[PDB]
Amino acid sequence: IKLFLSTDDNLSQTYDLSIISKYLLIASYICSYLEPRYDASIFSRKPRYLQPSLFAIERLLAIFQAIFPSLMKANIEVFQNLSELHTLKLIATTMNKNIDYLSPKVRWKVNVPWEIIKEISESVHFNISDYF
């Protein structure tokens, strides 16, 4: 019965990431699906099915700082994890030839679906579901 209940055509903790990497991914998913209008409204003390939009590096860093549990700031480890995310095909770019991250015309977008980020947030105990 168990052989028929599953197709088993599948090729087979789904993504081993550092805490910095997990929070970076959480912030990137917010950036790629939340309007720029609501950033100051939500994070400052003053949609599930569409394709993701682009975002700038500063928006990602600011949201990461706002959601990271006194400031975490940006060290070499943060950017190293961010580059690992790109190398792992978790974050996409707007370029295909002669990759140069420092070119001021390249934007970022999320390649990770909802079903994985849900479990990442569950493992982080961060309530994304209340931000939408």
Partner: protein, 92 residues
């Protein structure tokens, strides 16, 4: 019959809570925390004492009063700020 009286033994424990609430309400849409809300802590502490029929306001009554007022203030903020104020008032 029961009319508990107050003592100034725990003036700091109330004053610092009032200052903390006012500081956290300085730049967020929240309750209009004023002196009238400070009086609520004292009156609800008196009500807690009047359950024991004690003639004096004790430290435990003030502790429960501060707990109730601070929890009521915190549970009304927005989601993004609620999880921060959860830890900002961990003392109480």
């Amino acid at each position: 019959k029961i009319y508990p009286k107050l003592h100034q033994m725990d003036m700091d424990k109330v004053s610092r809570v009032y200052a903390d609430l006012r500081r956290e309400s300085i730049s967020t849409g929240s309750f209009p925390i004023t002196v009238r809300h400070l009086e609520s802590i004292l009156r609800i502490a008196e009500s807690f004492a009047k359950m024991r029929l004690s003639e004096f306001v004790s430290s435990y009554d003030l502790d429960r009063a501060i707990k109730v007022v601070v929890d009521s203030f915190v549970d009304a903020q927005k989601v993004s700020v609620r999880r921060q104020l959860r830890r900002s008032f961990a003392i109480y």
